[PDB]
């Protein structure tokens, strides 16, 4: 549905995808982003 | 800027917020979502 602003990969193109009422993110985005923000 | 589809909290309302070209998510969303998807 929505592409990752970071991964830009399709919702199903990634092995793990989390769907939200308006936000879509995969595991690499949070894994890489969580490490930076944390 | 954009509210979390899950947290619905403002971009600055959360202590940790990751900004993306079109996706905004905080630590609780990925922490709780990552545990479920993983
Ligand atoms: Zn992603
Ligand atoms: Zn959030």
Swiss-Prot record, chains A, B:
Disruption of the gene: reported phenotype: Delayed and decreased induction of the extracytoplasmic-stress response.
Instruction: Name the source's superkingdom.
Output: Bacteria
The residue ranges of the ClpX-type ZB domain are 1-38
Q: What induces it?
A: By heat shock. Part of the clpP-clpX operon, clpX can be expressed individually from its own promoter.
Binding positions for Zn(2+)? 4, 7, 26, 29
Protein family: Belongs to the ClpX chaperone family.
Function according to Swiss-Prot or TrEMBL: ATP-dependent specificity component of the Clp protease. Uses cycles of ATP binding and hydrolysis to unfold proteins and translocate them to the ClpP protease. It directs the protease to specific substrates both with and without the help of adapter proteins such as SspB. Participates in the final steps of RseA-sigma-E degradation, liberating sigma-E to induce the extracytoplasmic-stress response. It may bind to the lambda O substrate protein and present it to the ClpP protease in a form that can be recognized and readily hydrolyzed by ClpP.
User: What's the protein name?
Assistant: ATP-dependent Clp protease ATP-binding subunit ClpX
Q: Which organism is it from?
A: Escherichia coli (strain K12)
Q: Which gene encodes it?
A: clpX
